[PDB]
Amino acid sequence: SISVTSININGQPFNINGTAPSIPAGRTQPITFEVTPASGKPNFSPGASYTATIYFSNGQGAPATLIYQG
Amino acid sequence: LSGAIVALILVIAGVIIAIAVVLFAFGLIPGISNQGSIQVLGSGTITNSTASGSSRTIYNITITVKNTGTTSISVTSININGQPFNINGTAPSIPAGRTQPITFEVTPASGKPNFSPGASYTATIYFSNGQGAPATLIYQG
Amino acid sequence: LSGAIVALILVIAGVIIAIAVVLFAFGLIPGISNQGSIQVLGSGTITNSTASGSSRTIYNITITVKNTGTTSISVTSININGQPFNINGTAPSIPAGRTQPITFEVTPASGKPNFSPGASYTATIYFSNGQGAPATLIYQG
Amino acid sequence: LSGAIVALILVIAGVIIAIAVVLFAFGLIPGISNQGSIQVLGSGTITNSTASGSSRTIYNITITVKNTGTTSISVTSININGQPFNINGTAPSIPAGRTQPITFEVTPASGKPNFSPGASYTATIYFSNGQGAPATLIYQG
Amino acid sequence: LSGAIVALILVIAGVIIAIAVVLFAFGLIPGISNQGSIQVLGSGTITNSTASGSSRTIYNITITVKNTGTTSISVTSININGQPFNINGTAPSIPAGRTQPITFEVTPASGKPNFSPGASYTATIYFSNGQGAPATLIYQG
Amino acid sequence: SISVTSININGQPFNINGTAPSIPAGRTQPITFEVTPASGKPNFSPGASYTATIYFSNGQGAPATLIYQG
Amino acid sequence: LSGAIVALILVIAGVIIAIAVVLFAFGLIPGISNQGSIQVLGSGTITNSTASGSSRTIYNITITVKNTGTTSISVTSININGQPFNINGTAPSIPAGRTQPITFEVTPASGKPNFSPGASYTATIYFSNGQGAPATLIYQG
Ligand SMILES: *[C@@H]1O[C@H](CO)[C@@H](O[C@@H]2O[C@H](CO[C@H]3O[C@H](CO)[C@@H](O)[C@H](O)[C@@H]3O)[C@@H](O)[C@H](O)[C@H]2NC(C)=O)[C@H](O)[C@H]1NC(C)=O
Ligand SMILES: *[C@@H]1O[C@H](CO)[C@@H](O[C@@H]2O[C@H](CO[C@H]3O[C@H](CO)[C@@H](O)[C@H](O)[C@@H]3O)[C@@H](O)[C@H](O)[C@H]2NC(C)=O)[C@H](O)[C@H]1NC(C)=O
Ligand SMILES: *[C@@H]1O[C@H](CO)[C@@H](O[C@@H]2O[C@H](CO[C@H]3O[C@H](CO)[C@@H](O)[C@H](O)[C@@H]3O)[C@@H](O)[C@H](O)[C@H]2NC(C)=O)[C@H](O)[C@H]1NC(C)=O
Ligand SMILES: *[C@@H]1O[C@H](CO)[C@@H](O[C@@H]2O[C@H](CO[C@H]3O[C@H](CO)[C@@H](O)[C@H](O)[C@@H]3O)[C@@H](O)[C@H](O)[C@H]2NC(C)=O)[C@H](O)[C@H]1NC(C)=O
Ligand SMILES: *[C@@H]1O[C@H](CO)[C@@H](O[C@@H]2O[C@H](CO[C@H]3O[C@H](CO)[C@@H](O)[C@H](O)[C@@H]3O)[C@@H](O)[C@H](O)[C@H]2NC(C)=O)[C@H](O)[C@H]1NC(C)=O
Ligand SMILES: *[C@@H]1O[C@H](CO)[C@@H](O[C@@H]2O[C@H](CO[C@H]3O[C@H](CO)[C@@H](O)[C@H](O)[C@@H]3O)[C@@H](O)[C@H](O)[C@H]2NC(C)=O)[C@H](O)[C@H]1NC(C)=O
Ligand SMILES: *[C@@H]1O[C@H](CO)[C@@H](O[C@@H]2O[C@H](CO[C@H]3O[C@H](CO)[C@@H](O)[C@H](O)[C@@H]3O)[C@@H](O)[C@H](O)[C@H]2NC(C)=O)[C@H](O)[C@H]1NC(C)=O
Ligand SMILES: *[C@@H]1O[C@H](CO)[C@@H](O[C@@H]2O[C@H](CO[C@H]3O[C@H](CO)[C@@H](O)[C@H](O)[C@@H]3O)[C@@H](O)[C@H](O)[C@H]2NC(C)=O)[C@H](O)[C@H]1NC(C)=O
Ligand SMILES: *[C@@H]1O[C@H](CO)[C@@H](O[C@@H]2O[C@H](CO[C@H]3O[C@H](CO)[C@@H](O)[C@H](O)[C@@H]3O)[C@@H](O)[C@H](O)[C@H]2NC(C)=O)[C@H](O)[C@H]1NC(C)=O
Ligand SMILES: *[C@@H]1O[C@H](CO)[C@@H](O[C@@H]2O[C@H](CO[C@H]3O[C@H](CO)[C@@H](O)[C@H](O)[C@@H]3O)[C@@H](O)[C@H](O)[C@H]2NC(C)=O)[C@H](O)[C@H]1NC(C)=O
Ligand SMILES: *[C@@H]1O[C@H](CO)[C@@H](O[C@@H]2O[C@H](CO[C@H]3O[C@H](CO)[C@@H](O)[C@H](O)[C@@H]3O)[C@@H](O)[C@H](O)[C@H]2NC(C)=O)[C@H](O)[C@H]1NC(C)=O
Ligand SMILES: *[C@@H]1O[C@H](CO)[C@@H](O[C@@H]2O[C@H](CO[C@H]3O[C@H](CO)[C@@H](O)[C@H](O)[C@@H]3O)[C@@H](O)[C@H](O)[C@H]2NC(C)=O)[C@H](O)[C@H]1NC(C)=O
Ligand SMILES: *[C@@H]1O[C@H](CO)[C@@H](O[C@@H]2O[C@H](CO[C@H]3O[C@H](CO)[C@@H](O)[C@H](O)[C@@H]3O)[C@@H](O)[C@H](O)[C@H]2NC(C)=O)[C@H](O)[C@H]1NC(C)=O
Ligand SMILES: *[C@@H]1O[C@H](CO)[C@@H](O[C@@H]2O[C@H](CO[C@H]3O[C@H](CO)[C@@H](O)[C@H](O)[C@@H]3O)[C@@H](O)[C@H](O)[C@H]2NC(C)=O)[C@H](O)[C@H]1NC(C)=O
Ligand SMILES: *[C@@H]1O[C@H](CO)[C@@H](O[C@@H]2O[C@H](CO[C@H]3O[C@H](CO)[C@@H](O)[C@H](O)[C@@H]3O)[C@@H](O)[C@H](O)[C@H]2NC(C)=O)[C@H](O)[C@H]1NC(C)=O
Ligand SMILES: *[C@@H]1O[C@H](CO)[C@@H](O[C@@H]2O[C@H](CO[C@H]3O[C@H](CO)[C@@H](O)[C@H](O)[C@@H]3O)[C@@H](O)[C@H](O)[C@H]2NC(C)=O)[C@H](O)[C@H]1NC(C)=O
């Protein structure tokens, strides 16, 4: 089982609010988690797509695309 | 001994980063769709809207916009006749799935325009989804 | 004497561990390099499945799909017109080497869509491979 | 004895440096995003801005720029028609998340341009995030 | 001594595995790069095949088709006037290098068409290649 | 002289039916051998490309593309 | 004792070889540009050049060619309107940096073509770069 530890979105660092989700071994899931900007504030536009990097307890990170819904 | 142990770490890391980059390339694809959400319907109008003797020329751009996307989208800039214009006050937005006459105030950023009553100007309107749309605007006076 | 016998042990052990890591690198190749994919053929269709004033809107999605791999693979998500959708019920599994029209039901994950009868929407279907395919779906009504 | 003790140190150091390099490769990834922050909207304008009889030709470049990034970004250079230009005074900056008509003074670094009234010049604008953007500029006189 | 012999093994094994991947890349070329296609020549025709008040409407489709590839290829779907149709019975297979009038029967997949005698409909035929061809069909009655 | 010891097609294990084919020293040649799926039931499609990794008596594995004909 | 000295030499040599490989990667770039040294510009002409009812029809291929490379470059082969053709004489060659008319005699490689006065035919001329340039020849004879 491995958990998220940080996310960076559109270049900006974010902190996970509350307990970070843990993903069980061998499993596919939609995870959901809350985040706050670490410093500054973002300028997300409805329907725009942002490159993000999620970092896991492995130290491994994954590039991702997130679409801002509103 | 060291070299083989190092090569093993870098092989496994190579597989992990390569797969993550391939998944990212598949993961981009949904974002591309939204670049086409807006289209501009018919001729719009430009109208001189400033008060008498005011320091700033301010015009009024009315256009029908259609939003085929799943999110609200806003006008971010307009280029008229080759001139960039600044958008005054709050940008207008068009709701998801709707078609509406949209109205906004603009002021010229380069020089001053010399619009002629009943003359037809090609604009390009730019929207918050990162899209440009060609438009025709008729100056009303 | 000692230094030379130890140097020889570490030469021999170096050969052994280096060859073990080289054989491991050859052993990765089958897992990382499976060719072939789910291919999506022609346009699909979206149809309103929602009935009897139900609280959740459900859509049929029908599309022709060709599995060119050697294993059965299933749909896992679809994104349509930028919006994410969940598969309702059990997702369809496409047998190895086979071409089929698949049909599956979907609900919007959040918000709601604004499909127009006869309009064409870009969609991305994601399979159990993590591979996705861009597709065009025409909304039927 | 010595050889085995040395090999042990170099094995453990090998693991540590290899892991640190793998973590660095994952740690680079957020920096790549920022290379796409800017885009240039519509035609800009060039205007001759120098005073009568002055030794230096100085032009005025007005363009709409959109910053989708999370930080302020500034214009660092412009190349017009294939000529490099120097940027005079302070570089302009566009705030995080905003779309603005941006204006700056430039002077030619190679030879002199011979801009023609109403003629259209392809430029490339370069920004402090390390990004180039193609632009069209119309010379106003 | 050990470190250098291990470095040399990993140089040699690196050459071997790199050349193996380069030879694999050359080995992909024939499968990914088959030239030539089904070409659709002139207009086709749609004719009402439905008889005796049958519950399902069936249409003849006749069109001239030229296979410029080296393998026999079959139709798999047609879309006409935006609407999907299923091939009834066994789909026709077009021999390599050959020009033929093919004829096949089709039924609407969902809904029903509104063909007008003498009107021309844009259609897309999809072949076993996954390749499709736009076509014009004239409805005969 | 070096022989095919095992083959994996598109990630799946496969068994050489007959005796193993063997290629003499210094030779370049066509090599042909009969093979069966080791587990399950694959289904190849005409003109589609499948990777095979062929493993030789060196322990060496070579990736190859096979195009299905049948 | 030796293991550390060997590790140091291979660390230092690793830096040298990695930098050398990076420099080699750039050093290819001016080289590969020569792949596009030739431009064929304007319309060319093709003219009957044979005499006295001789057994070979021979033609006049005149084109204007610009060589941007640092070596003299020659016509290796020509294909006219899809058909193979053989240069009768020795190949024409265009010096480095020159723009000039180039003229050469050519014969059909197979069959018997028949050009019509004032009609336009494509030729692709293949140069000693392996580069092919399409050109239009107008027939004169
Ligand atoms: C970040 O994580 C906190 C837990 O790590 C979480 O605390 C919990 O808060 C909920 C209720 O929170 C509501 O009210 C607060 C004001 O008190 C708002 O800031 C917040 O946004 C919510 O509207 C409470 O039921 C629960 O017991 C708390 N848990 C713990 C362990 O303290 C924060 O709420 C969360 N921050 C946000 C903004 O959601
Ligand atoms: C997400 O929701 C937040 C709460 O509604 C909102 O923050 C509030 O924003 C207003 C002013 O910010 C303006 O700019 C943002 C740009 O994203 C607009 O979305 C928003 O409509 C306003 O025009 C501020 O006065 C108020 O104090 C904020 N409240 C909080 C909770 O901080 C965010 O703006 C909104 N979007 C983003 C990208 O975070
Ligand atoms: C920019 O032009 C807009 C288009 O006319 C306008 O907003 C619109 O308002 C009109 C109605 O305007 C009349 O009626 C109001 C009373 O309801 C009076 O205040 C005013 O004097 C008018 O003659 C409406 O029909 C239209 O739909 C609105 N906009 C849209 C969505 O098209 C603005 O007033 C104008 N602004 C300036 C400063 O010129
Ligand atoms: C928008 O309306 C303004 C008045 O509501 C008007 O200002 C007046 O301008 C006139 C003269 O207009 C000419 O000269 C100006 C420069 O002075 C040009 O920009 C303009 O295109 C005309 O060629 C002036 O006599 C008067 O004092 C101004 N004020 C009032 C109360 O009348 C703007 O000129 C007008 N702009 C456009 C484009 O029509
Ligand atoms: C480079 O061009 C700029 C674009 O015009 C300009 O800055 C802009 O200033 C204009 C307003 O200029 C007029 O009004 C001021 C009085 O407010 C007078 O000083 C001047 O004589 C003008 O006719 C403004 O509309 C525009 O938004 C500004 N820039 C932007 C962000 O677009 C500079 O003045 C000019 N510099 C030179 C040396 O040419
Ligand atoms: C989406 O695909 C479903 C199968 O995956 C399909 O279910 C089948 O429904 C048919 C009957 O469907 C008719 O009636 C419904 C209303 O009940 C209409 O919405 C529909 O358009 C048809 O007119 C039934 O015979 C069959 O046994 C069902 N099979 C399964 C596996 O459920 C849905 O009908 C289909 N939805 C639409 C709108 O086509
Ligand atoms: C698919 O069918 C759904 C069931 O009939 C329908 O949802 C119902 O819609 C009405 C009002 O939504 C309106 O807007 C949609 C736009 O798509 C129109 O198609 C529809 O005619 C109405 O004008 C709502 O009152 C009712 O509660 C909904 N019922 C459910 C099951 O949610 C959808 O609207 C329809 N289309 C789409 C795109 O999902
Ligand atoms: C989403 O998938 C569910 C299975 O994963 C499926 O449950 C099955 O439902 C059918 C009958 O469903 C009808 O009635 C319900 C209300 O109870 C409606 O919401 C629904 O739309 C249908 O009209 C039942 O025969 C079957 O046993 C259920 N299977 C299981 C495993 O529970 C849901 O119906 C499906 N949602 C929709 C909207 O189709
Ligand atoms: C920008 O404006 C300057 C004046 O504000 C102008 O300087 C004048 O130039 C004219 C003649 O211009 C021609 O010749 C010059 C070389 O002398 C060329 O660079 C230019 O493109 C024209 O072909 C001269 O008679 C006069 O004395 C100068 N000064 C004034 C006060 O008029 C610049 O030439 C002008 N640059 C451009 C590109 O328009
Ligand atoms: C190599 O090209 C350089 C680029 O032009 C040039 O240095 C530049 O000098 C120009 C200005 O040159 C003009 O003005 C000076 C008077 O100030 C005259 O001496 C001369 O005749 C010119 O027409 C300057 O704009 C530019 O910024 C300088 N260089 C840079 C940093 O771009 C050199 O003169 C030239 N050298 C040779 C031998 O060709
Ligand atoms: C669509 O193509 C069919 C062949 O793929 C063809 O079947 C042949 O039919 C002919 C006789 O057709 C005549 O009679 C039917 C009514 O029975 C009319 O609909 C039709 O227009 C003709 O007047 C028969 O001799 C032949 O053996 C059949 N061959 C096969 C392979 O079935 C259909 O007739 C054709 N439909 C139409 C409307 O032309
Ligand atoms: C769609 O394809 C079927 C074969 O895939 C074909 O079945 C054949 O049918 C013919 C005779 O069909 C006639 O009668 C049926 C009613 O039984 C009508 O629906 C049909 O339109 C024809 O008038 C038969 O000789 C042959 O043996 C069948 N072949 C097989 C393999 O079953 C269907 O007829 C065909 N549908 C239509 C509408 O033509
Ligand atoms: C799978 O491998 C077997 C050995 O590697 C091979 O055995 C050889 O068989 C041939 C003759 O086989 C025929 O008869 C058998 C029944 O006994 C059939 O199953 C088969 O299809 C053939 O028709 C024999 O001459 C030879 O000596 C055998 N070799 C050895 C080493 O014993 C099988 O033939 C092979 N399977 C197939 C289907 O070829
Ligand atoms: C697939 O491989 C089978 C053996 O690996 C082979 O069966 C053996 O067939 C040969 C017949 O000799 C011919 O083999 C093929 C065509 O059959 C040609 O490439 C070749 O030049 C010869 O003409 C037979 O002698 C032998 O006993 C069979 N079995 C063994 C154990 O050797 C199949 O023929 C082959 N099929 C295809 C389509 O390639
Ligand atoms: C086709 O190419 C030949 C070499 O590229 C070229 O040979 C040259 O010939 C000229 C003189 O040729 C005359 O005489 C011959 C008979 O021997 C006739 O066929 C021809 O039409 C001319 O009348 C000679 O000076 C030169 O040295 C030769 N070059 C070489 C490299 O040997 C042929 O002339 C050419 N065909 C034609 C029709 O010109
Ligand atoms: C077609 O090209 C032939 C050679 O490629 C050429 O024959 C050679 O002719 C020249 C004569 O010199 C003249 O060439 C043409 C007109 O004849 C003019 O463009 C050019 O300016 C010269 O006036 C002769 O010296 C030479 O020996 C011939 N052969 C070779 C191998 O060079 C034809 O003249 C030419 N025909 C046409 C109509 O362009």
Side-chain angles (χ1 to χ4, degrees):
Chain A
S1 199
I2 286 153
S3 59
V4 306
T5 62
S6 282
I7 195 176
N8 182 295
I9 312 171
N10 197 26
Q12 178 172 33
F14 286 71
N15 307 123
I16 316 295
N17 195 90
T19 54
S22 190
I23 307 89
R27 195 164 299 283
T28 307
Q29 295 184 321
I31 57 168
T32 300
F33 53 99
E34 282 189 317
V35 303
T36 61
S39 61
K41 67 187 178 73
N43 300 96
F44 304 129
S45 178
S49 59
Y50 298 97
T51 55
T53 314
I54 305 76
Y55 288 97
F56 306 96
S57 63
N58 293 340
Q60 183 229 327
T65 292
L66 304 178
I67 300 168
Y68 177 75
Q69 303 299 297
Chain B
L1 301 178
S2 184
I5 293 297
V6 166
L8 181 61
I9 291 162
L10 296 169
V11 162
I12 292 162
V15 172
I16 296 166
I17 303 182
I19 291 171
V21 169
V22 166
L23 291 169
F24 173 80
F26 292 119
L28 274 168
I29 296 173
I32 305 167
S33 305
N34 297 345
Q35 298 291 141
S37 301
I38 295 290
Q39 57 204 44
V40 176
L41 306 180
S43 281
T45 61
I46 304 148
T47 298
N48 181 358
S49 46
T50 204
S52 301
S54 185
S55 188
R56 299 302 184 183
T57 52
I58 300 174
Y59 299 97
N60 199 359
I61 321 295
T62 301
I63 39 170
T64 298
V65 186
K66 169 170 167 69
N67 184 0
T68 68
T70 49
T71 54
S72 301
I73 289 166
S74 62
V75 181
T76 61
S77 193
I78 195 179
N79 196 279
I80 312 174
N81 214 20
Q83 313 284 248
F85 278 73
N86 195 47
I87 298 190
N88 174 27
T90 186
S93 64
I94 178 160
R98 285 182 55 84
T99 303
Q100 299 195 165
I102 286 294
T103 297
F104 52 109
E105 286 172 8
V106 304
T107 190
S110 176
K112 286 182 177 181
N114 294 281
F115 301 128
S116 179
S120 176
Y121 297 93
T122 67
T124 299
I125 332 295
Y126 287 95
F127 293 94
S128 70
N129 67 318
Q131 182 181 1
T136 293
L137 301 178
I138 315 299
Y139 178 76
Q140 302 301 292
Chain C
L1 265 60
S2 184
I5 300 304
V6 169
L8 182 57
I9 291 163
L10 296 168
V11 164
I12 291 166
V15 172
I16 294 159
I17 294 159
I19 291 172
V21 169
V22 168
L23 291 169
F24 175 83
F26 291 125
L28 283 168
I29 300 179
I32 70 179
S33 73
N34 64 303
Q35 182 165 8
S37 58
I38 301 300
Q39 289 180 4
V40 172
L41 308 185
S43 314
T45 59
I46 307 144
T47 305
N48 235 8
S49 188
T50 318
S52 305
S54 298
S55 60
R56 65 199 290 253
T57 57
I58 186 160
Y59 298 91
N60 273 42
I61 295 184
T62 299
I63 198 157
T64 301
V65 69
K66 173 177 181 176
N67 184 354
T68 59
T70 53
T71 52
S72 199
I73 286 153
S74 59
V75 306
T76 62
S77 282
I78 195 176
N79 182 295
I80 312 171
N81 197 26
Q83 178 172 34
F85 286 71
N86 307 123
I87 317 295
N88 195 90
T90 54
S93 190
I94 307 89
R98 195 164 299 283
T99 307
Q100 295 184 321
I102 57 168
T103 300
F104 53 100
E105 282 189 317
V106 303
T107 61
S110 61
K112 67 187 178 73
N114 300 96
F115 304 129
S116 178
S120 59
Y121 298 97
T122 55
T124 314
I125 305 76
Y126 288 97
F127 306 96
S128 63
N129 293 340
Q131 182 229 327
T136 292
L137 304 178
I138 300 168
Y139 177 75
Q140 303 299 297
Chain D
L1 301 178
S2 184
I5 293 297
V6 166
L8 181 61
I9 291 162
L10 296 169
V11 162
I12 292 162
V15 172
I16 296 166
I17 303 182
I19 291 171
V21 169
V22 166
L23 291 169
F24 173 80
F26 292 119
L28 274 168
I29 296 173
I32 305 167
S33 305
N34 297 345
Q35 298 291 141
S37 301
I38 295 290
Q39 57 204 44
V40 176
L41 306 180
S43 282
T45 61
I46 304 148
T47 298
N48 181 358
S49 46
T50 204
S52 301
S54 185
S55 188
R56 299 302 184 183
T57 52
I58 300 174
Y59 299 97
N60 199 359
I61 321 295
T62 301
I63 39 170
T64 298
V65 186
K66 169 170 167 69
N67 184 0
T68 68
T70 49
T71 54
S72 301
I73 289 166
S74 62
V75 181
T76 61
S77 193
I78 195 179
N79 196 279
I80 312 174
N81 214 20
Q83 313 284 248
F85 278 73
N86 195 47
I87 298 190
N88 174 27
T90 186
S93 64
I94 178 160
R98 285 182 55 84
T99 304
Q100 299 195 165
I102 286 294
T103 297
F104 52 109
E105 286 172 8
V106 304
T107 190
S110 176
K112 286 182 177 181
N114 294 281
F115 301 128
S116 179
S120 176
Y121 297 93
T122 67
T124 299
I125 333 295
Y126 287 95
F127 294 94
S128 70
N129 67 318
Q131 182 181 1
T136 293
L137 301 178
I138 315 299
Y139 178 76
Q140 302 301 292
Chain E
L1 265 60
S2 183
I5 300 304
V6 169
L8 182 57
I9 291 163
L10 296 168
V11 164
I12 291 166
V15 172
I16 294 159
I17 294 159
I19 291 172
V21 169
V22 168
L23 291 169
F24 175 83
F26 291 125
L28 283 168
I29 300 179
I32 70 179
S33 73
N34 64 303
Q35 182 165 8
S37 58
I38 301 300
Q39 289 180 4
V40 172
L41 308 185
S43 314
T45 59
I46 307 144
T47 305
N48 235 8
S49 188
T50 318
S52 305
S54 298
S55 60
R56 65 199 290 253
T57 57
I58 186 160
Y59 298 91
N60 273 42
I61 295 184
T62 299
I63 198 156
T64 301
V65 69
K66 173 177 182 176
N67 184 354
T68 59
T70 53
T71 52
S72 199
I73 286 153
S74 59
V75 306
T76 62
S77 282
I78 195 176
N79 182 295
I80 312 171
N81 197 26
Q83 178 172 33
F85 286 71
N86 307 123
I87 316 295
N88 195 90
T90 54
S93 190
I94 307 89
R98 196 164 299 283
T99 306
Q100 295 184 321
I102 57 168
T103 300
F104 53 100
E105 282 189 317
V106 303
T107 61
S110 61
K112 67 187 178 73
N114 300 96
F115 304 129
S116 178
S120 59
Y121 298 97
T122 55
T124 314
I125 305 76
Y126 288 97
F127 306 96
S128 63
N129 293 340
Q131 183 229 327
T136 292
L137 304 178
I138 300 168
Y139 177 75
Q140 303 299 297
Chain F
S1 198
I2 284 156
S3 61
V4 173
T5 63
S6 69
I7 179 171
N8 178 299
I9 306 185
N10 224 60
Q12 321 310 302
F14 269 76
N15 299 118
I16 296 95
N17 182 105
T19 189
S22 187
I23 178 163
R27 298 298 301 277
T28 305
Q29 58 164 104
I31 285 289
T32 296
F33 54 104
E34 298 275 35
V35 83
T36 58
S39 186
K41 176 54 176 66
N43 179 50
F44 306 107
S45 55
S49 296
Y50 300 89
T51 66
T53 65
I54 306 97
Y55 287 101
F56 297 89
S57 65
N58 311 326
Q60 186 186 0
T65 292
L66 308 182
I67 300 174
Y68 181 77
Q69 305 296 312
Chain G
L1 187 59
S2 75
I5 300 300
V6 167
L8 182 60
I9 292 164
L10 295 167
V11 164
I12 293 170
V15 180
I16 301 302
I17 300 160
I19 294 168
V21 169
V22 165
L23 288 167
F24 181 93
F26 290 115
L28 289 153
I29 297 163
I32 58 173
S33 77
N34 292 289
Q35 189 62 85
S37 300
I38 295 288
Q39 289 173 358
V40 180
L41 62 94
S43 61
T45 63
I46 175 169
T47 311
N48 216 342
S49 65
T50 204
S52 65
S54 299
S55 307
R56 281 188 164 192
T57 45
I58 315 169
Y59 288 98
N60 279 92
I61 311 300
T62 301
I63 47 170
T64 300
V65 187
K66 174 172 184 179
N67 182 4
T68 307
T70 60
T71 57
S72 198
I73 284 156
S74 61
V75 173
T76 62
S77 69
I78 179 171
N79 178 299
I80 306 185
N81 224 60
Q83 321 310 302
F85 268 76
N86 299 118
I87 296 95
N88 182 105
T90 189
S93 187
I94 178 163
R98 298 298 301 277
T99 305
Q100 58 164 104
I102 285 289
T103 296
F104 54 104
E105 298 275 35
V106 83
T107 58
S110 186
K112 176 54 176 66
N114 179 50
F115 306 107
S116 55
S120 296
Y121 300 89
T122 66
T124 65
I125 306 97
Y126 287 101
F127 297 89
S128 64
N129 311 326
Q131 186 186 0
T136 292
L137 308 182
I138 300 174
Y139 181 77
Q140 305 296 312

